[model samples]
Target: ASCRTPKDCADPCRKETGCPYGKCMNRKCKCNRC
Candidate 1:
């Protein structure tokens, strides 16, 4: 998968790392692990 914009990674970051706790940044997945 090729990411271009923030919206591109919106749902990706969630489902990939777990939603609610994850956010898309710089077209990347930022997950808040507990």
Candidate 2:
């Protein structure tokens, strides 16, 4: 797969708005719709 799983996926979002829905990576959110 291109990306990691949700559970395995790290919480990269440091800011509250960073991870609005989906998991984060490198402290950046990809978004739930992503």
Candidate 3:
């Protein structure tokens, strides 16, 4: 995704019981680090 702002980089996954799902890096949700 093309992010014009930092707000665009956000974690959309909502799980209250496990590993830290994903992260918005470089404007994309990465399940794992690159």
Candidate 4:
């Protein structure tokens, strides 16, 4: 997901708007739309 934290994911959520936070459930530096 682009709206993830840690500046991980494919995109930076901080640079966007209306995008909610996702969790790094697998600790793989990924974000989810869930």
Per-residue CA lDDT of model 1 for 1-34, tens digit only, reads 3345545554555666655354456645455444
Cα RMSD (Å) between model 4 and the true structure?
A: 5.8
Q: All candidates: CA RMSD in angstroms?
A: 3.6, 7.2, 5.9, 5.8
Note the residue pairs that clash in candidate 4.
none
For candidate 3, give the lDDT. 0.38
Estimate the overall C-alpha local distance difference test score of candidate 2. 0.40
Q: Pick by lDDT: which candidate is best? A: 1
Candidate 2 C-alpha lDDT tens digits along 1-34 = 1226443233432233344345545543354543
Candidate 3 on 1-34: residue-level lDDT in tens?
Answer: 3333333333333232233444555655543222
Q: Candidate 2: where are CA atoms >4 Å away?
A: 1-20
Stretches > 4 Å off in candidate 3: 1-11, 15-20, 31-34
Selected candidate, larger TM-score, 2 vs 4? 2
Minimal lDDT window, size 10, model 2: 7-16
Mind giving the per-residue lDDT tens digits that candidate 4 earns over 1-34? 4323454553533333334343443444443343
Model 1 worst lDDT run, 10 consecutive residues: 1-10
Model 3 TM-score (2 dp) = 0.24
Candidate 3 RMSD computed on C-alpha atoms after optimal superposition onto the true structure: 5.9
Better of 1 and 4 by TM-score: 1
**Candidates' C-alpha lDDT:** 0.52, 0.40, 0.38, 0.41
Models 1 onward score TM values of: 0.32, 0.25, 0.24, 0.21
Provide the lDDT at 1 for model 4: 41
